[PDB]
Amino acid sequence: EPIMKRTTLVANTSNMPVAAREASIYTGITLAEYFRDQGKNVSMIADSSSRWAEALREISGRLGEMPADQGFPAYLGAKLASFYERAGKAVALGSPDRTGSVSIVAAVSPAGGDFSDPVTTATLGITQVFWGLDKKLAQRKHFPSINTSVSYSKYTNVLNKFYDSNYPEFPVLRDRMKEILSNAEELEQVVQLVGKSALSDSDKITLDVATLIKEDFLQQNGYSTYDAFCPIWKTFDMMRAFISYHDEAQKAVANGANWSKLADSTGDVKHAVSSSKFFEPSRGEKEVHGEFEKLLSTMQERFAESTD
Amino acid sequence: AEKRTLIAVIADEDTTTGLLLAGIGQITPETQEKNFFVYQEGKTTKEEITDKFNHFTEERDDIAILLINQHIAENIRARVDSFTNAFPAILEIPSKDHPYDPEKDSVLKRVRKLF
Amino acid sequence: SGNREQVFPTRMTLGLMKTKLKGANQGYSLLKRKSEALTKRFRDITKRIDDAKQKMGRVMQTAAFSLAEVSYATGENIGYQVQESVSTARFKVRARQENVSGVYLSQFESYIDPEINDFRLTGLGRGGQQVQRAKEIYSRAVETLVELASLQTAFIILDEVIKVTNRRVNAIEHVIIPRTENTIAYINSELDELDREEFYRLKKVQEKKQNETAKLDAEMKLK
Amino acid sequence: LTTAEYLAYQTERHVLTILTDMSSYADALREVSAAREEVPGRRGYPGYMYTDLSTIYERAGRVEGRNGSITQIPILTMPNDDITHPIPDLTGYITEGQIFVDRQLHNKGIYPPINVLPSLSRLMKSAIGEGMTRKDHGDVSNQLYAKYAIGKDAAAMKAVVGEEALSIEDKLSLEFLEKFEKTFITQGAYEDRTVFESLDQAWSLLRIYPKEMLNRISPKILDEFYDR
C-alpha cells in the first residue's frame, strides 16, 4: 500500500510568504495532534525548523521588535518549546479510552557548519534526542554521517524496559560500542600527532575495531536493498557480533598473541563481521538470527584456534 | 637487511687476524670477494683505504658493521660523514697497533659534543 | 602584528581555532615529555658508549694477546693460514628491532654461527682458546656497535622531536593564539559593536517616533 | 529561594536548593529583557544579569542568629561547551567553585560523568575535618586528585612512549585510573554512598600505591590508614 494513505504533506516553498512559512509548522503539528487524538501513533517530519526560525526572525524584523542574538527574536526558544512539547505520548481526550503519540522528527539546517547558531542552541534545550552532524564523515562520504561524540538520546533510560523484554543486552552493547568509539577517538587524536608506532597491541585493537564499526555498522547505504532499513533485531545481532569481535580480540591479545599475526589469521572472521551488514532483512528474523548465531560460533571457534 | 659480520678494513693486521680467527669474515663467490678487507696498514694507499671503506659502507648491502681501529686519516676524514645511515653500514673503532685513544674517535667526539 | 593565519573571522572559525590551539598545546606538551623520555634514554646510551669505549679497548687487547699466545703455541704467526679461513663467518650480527622508549631502534644482536667453526681448526691446540677469546671480544664489540647505532638513531629521533616541539612552542602556538585573539577580540567585538549601534539607532528612531505620537496625542487632548 | 529562605531562616532547617537548567532561566531572562525594548548585551544576553544571578545565588549561606542554612547547587548547561559563555562565566564569578559533567566521561558509560580534574570546591576545606566527616578526608581527596592527574598524563604517554617505557608510578596510575573511573566515580543512579563509605572506597583505591610516593597524604594519616 502507498505511504500517501498514511501521509499528508504541508508543502511550503521558500518563495511563499514568510507568514505561511511560520504557520506551516503549526498546521502540521495540529494535524499530527488530530491524528494522535484518534489513538494513532503519528510521526511529524519538519523539513527545516531552522527555516521556521528564520521566518520568525523576518516577522520580528517587520514588527520592529528588539532581537536577542544574531537577530533572532527573544522568544525563539519559547516558540520552539511550545512546538516541540506538543509531541509526547498521550491518552486522547474523551471516551473511549485510547492512546496516541506524536513523534516530532524535526531537521535543522546548520549555519556555518557549527552549533553556534541560535536555532540549534535553543533546540538542544528541548529535544531529548539530537542526531548531530559530522562534516568529517560527511566530506568523506560516510553516511548517514552522525557525529557520535556530540549526538545524544535521553530516551536510553526509558527504553531499558523495552530492551529487557526483547533484547536484554542491547543497552550493555550500546554502551560498549560508545566506550570503544570514544577511546579510539582519543587514541586517534593522539596518533595523528604521534603515530601508530608506540601504541600497545590493545590500543591497536581498539583503533581497528572502531574503524570496523564506523565503516560497517554505523555506515549505512540507505539506497541498498540489503540495508535500506536495518531491523532492530538485525542491529542488535550486529552489535553482538562487533562487540564479540572486540572482546575475543582483546582476550586473545591478553594471552600474549601478537596483534598482527592474529589479524592476518582472523581476516576471515573480520570479513564475516564486515559482511554481516549484507544480510537481507527480508529473509526473516529467524533466518537472520540463526545465521548471526552461526557467525558468532564461527568467530569463537576461530579465535580459540588461533589463540593456541 | 641481511645479517653480516663486521669488516676490518680500517683495523690493524693483528686486529684483522683476530677477527678472522673469531670468524668475522665470509667469502663472496659471486665476485671472489670477502666480507673483510685486507688490513694492509702502512702498505696500502690512503685512497685505496678510502675506496675500500666506501665499498664496505656504501656498495655493500649487507648489515656488516665496520672496524676503524686506529685508522689513518684516510678514514678519520671520511668518518665525519660515514656515520650517517648507520644501517646497514655501522661503524666502530677497535684497538689496533696504535693505541685506541678516544681523542680521535668520531663517535665519542660527537657524543661528547652533544653534551 | 605577529604571525597570522589570515582566516575568516566567524564564530565557527573561532571555535575551530580554539580547538586547534588546544590540540597543538596538548601535542606540544605530549611531544615535550616524549622528548624528555627520549633524551633520558639518550643520556643513558651516551654513558654506555663512554665507558664501553675503554671496556672494549681492554677486551680487544685481551683478544690480541690470546691470538698471539696461540701464535706462540703454533710456532710462526697464524697469518695466511688464518686468512685463508675467510670462506665462512663464525660470528654475525643478527637483525633485531627493539622499541626503546617508543622508537623502533635497530639494535643489532650478535649471534655466532652454530653450524661451522672450522676457521680455527689448524696447527696447535691453543687455537680453540684464542678463537673463544676473540669470539667473546667480538660479542663485546658487537654490543658496543649496537649501542652506537642506538645512540645515532636516538639522536636523529630526539633532534626531530625537539625541533617539532620548539616549532609548536614558538611558531604554531604563537601564531594560532594571535589568530584567535584577532578573530574574537577584534572582529567579533566589532560585529557586536555594529549590531549594538544599529539596534540603538533603531531604538532611537522608535522612541522619537513614539514620543512625537505621544506629544500629538497630548496636544489633541489639550485642544 | 523564597521557600528555602523561609524554611532555613524561620523554621531553622538545613535547606539544599537545586536550581536545574540555569541556562534556560537565562534564556527566559533574555526574552524578558528584549520584551522591554532593551538592547541586548554580550552574546545577546542582557548586560545586567550578573546582578540577577547574584540576587538568585546570594540568597544562601548560613547566618548568625539562625541555626538553619541554605546550600545552593545551580545546574546550568554550557551552550556549545565553553566556559567563556556569559552564563557559566557569571556563575563562576558569583558562586564558590563548580562541578563539571564531562561529555567524554559520559560517552564512556561512566555515571556520574563528573570530571574531577576541572571541578573544584573553593571552600571544601571548611566541610571536612575531625568532627566533620573524618580526619583523613582532605588528604585523601588531595591524593585522589594527584593520582588521577598522574594517571591521565600516563594515559597520554601510554600511546606515545609505550606501556613498558612508563615509570612504575605510571603503571600503577593507569590501573588506578581504571579502577577510579569505573568503580569510585562510577556510582549507580540509585547507589547512596555515605561519606565514610566513599572515603574507604577511596582508601581501597589508594592501597595499591606504595608508601614513598603517596606523598600528598600526611605521614600521620598515611601511617594510620594505609598500613592496614
Side-chain angles (χ1 to χ4, degrees), chain B residues 18 22-23, chain C residues 59-60 62-64 66-67 127-128 134 141:
Chain C
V59 180
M60 294 298 102
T62 62
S66 179
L67 185 74

Side-chain angles (χ1 to χ4, degrees), chain A residues 66-69 74-75 78 115-116 121 149-150 152 178-179 182-183 186-187 190 194-195 198-200 203, chain D residues 27 30-31 34 37-40 43-45 79-80 103-104 107-109 156 158-163 182:
Chain A
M66 274 279 148
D69 63 338
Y75 48 82
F115 301 136
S116 314
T121 311
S149 66
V150 307
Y152 62 81
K178 282 183 184 179
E179 188 205 20
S182 166
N183 291 355
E186 71 195 17
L187 271 193
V190 166
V194 173
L199 282 71
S200 168
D203 276 359
Chain D
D27 279 334
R30 172 175 59 179
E31 153 168 19
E37 291 84 4
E38 286 167 72
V39 177
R43 204 91 51 91
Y45 284 105
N80 297 295
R103 194 179 300 276
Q104 308 269 324
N107 296 345
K108 299 177 190 334
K158 178 181 42 82
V160 181
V161 302
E163 191 169 24
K182 311 183 265 313

Side-chain angles (χ1 to χ4, degrees), chain A residues 42-186:
Chain A
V42 60
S43 300
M44 212 207 68
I45 312 148
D47 169 73
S48 182
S49 56
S50 62
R51 294 299 98 77
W52 190 58
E54 299 203 348
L56 266 63
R57 201 199 39 209
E58 183 178 1
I59 295 166
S60 81
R62 323 300 296 256
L63 289 166
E65 293 179 353
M66 274 279 148
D69 63 338
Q70 293 179 356
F72 280 92
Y75 48 82
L76 182 69
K79 296 267 282 208
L80 281 71
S82 66
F83 157 56
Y84 269 96
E85 271 96 10
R86 301 168 76 165
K89 184 187 189 186
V91 183
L93 193 59
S95 296
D97 181 270
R98 59 196 183 267
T99 297
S101 57
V102 175
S103 310
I104 287 186
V105 177
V108 161
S109 76
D114 208 354
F115 301 136
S116 314
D117 78 315
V119 193
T120 300
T121 311
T123 310
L124 286 190
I126 315 156
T127 61
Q128 309 282 127
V129 175
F130 168 62
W131 295 327
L133 185 77
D134 192 321
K135 292 182 180 180
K136 294 181 176 67
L137 296 168
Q139 280 202 339
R140 304 196 155 66
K141 303 307 177 181
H142 165 281
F143 301 128
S145 85
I146 301 303
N147 192 337
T148 294
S149 66
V150 307
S151 176
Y152 62 81
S153 167
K154 282 184 212 253
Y155 288 128
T156 48
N157 263 27
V158 184
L159 274 173
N160 283 314
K161 204 203 59 163
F162 169 78
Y163 290 144
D164 291 331
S165 179
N166 295 269
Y167 318 119
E169 317 94 311
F170 203 111
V172 169
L173 303 159
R174 164 194 68 216
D175 283 323
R176 286 295 311 278
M177 293 177 70
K178 282 183 184 179
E179 188 205 20
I180 294 164
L181 284 165
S182 166
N183 291 355
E185 182 168 43
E186 71 195 17

Side-chain angles (χ1 to χ4, degrees), chain C residues 2-21:
Chain C
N3 194 24
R4 294 261 311 300
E5 288 273 10
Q6 285 150 8
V7 76
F8 299 100
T10 61
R11 279 273 180 212
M12 183 278 288
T13 299
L14 183 62
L16 187 153
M17 282 316 207
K18 292 233 281 193
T19 61
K20 153 151 189 183
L21 187 153

Side-chain angles (χ1 to χ4, degrees), chain D residues 74-188:
Chain D
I75 297 191
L76 60 88
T77 68
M78 291 144 66
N80 297 295
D81 282 87
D82 61 338
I83 301 299
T84 61
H85 192 268
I87 320 307
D89 215 339
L90 296 187
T91 308
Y93 291 166
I94 317 163
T95 54
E96 293 83 3
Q98 73 285 331
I99 311 297
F100 266 94
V101 181
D102 189 358
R103 194 179 300 276
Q104 308 269 324
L105 270 71
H106 182 54
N107 296 345
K108 299 177 190 334
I110 294 156
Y111 179 88
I114 286 166
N115 192 358
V116 191
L117 290 171
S119 66
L120 167 69
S121 176
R122 272 142 160 270
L123 58 85
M124 163 170 189
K125 70 214 176 313
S126 297
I128 56 181
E130 301 66 70
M132 308 185 186
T133 75
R134 216 156 75 197
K135 66 184 46 58
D136 63 310
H137 196 156
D139 56 26
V140 174
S141 72
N142 274 357
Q143 200 59 261
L144 277 170
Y145 189 98
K147 305 279 157 217
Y148 184 51
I150 294 160
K152 280 289 173 190
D153 291 331
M157 298 295 138
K158 178 181 42 82
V160 181
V161 302
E163 191 169 24
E164 69 275 16
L166 302 166
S167 68
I168 179 58
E169 288 285 308
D170 313 308
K171 274 85 74 175
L172 292 165
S173 296
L174 274 297
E175 61 76 10
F176 160 87
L177 176 136
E178 190 265 350
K179 297 187 69 193
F180 182 75
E181 289 192 345
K182 311 183 265 313
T183 68
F184 179 82
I185 300 305
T186 298
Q187 169 189 340

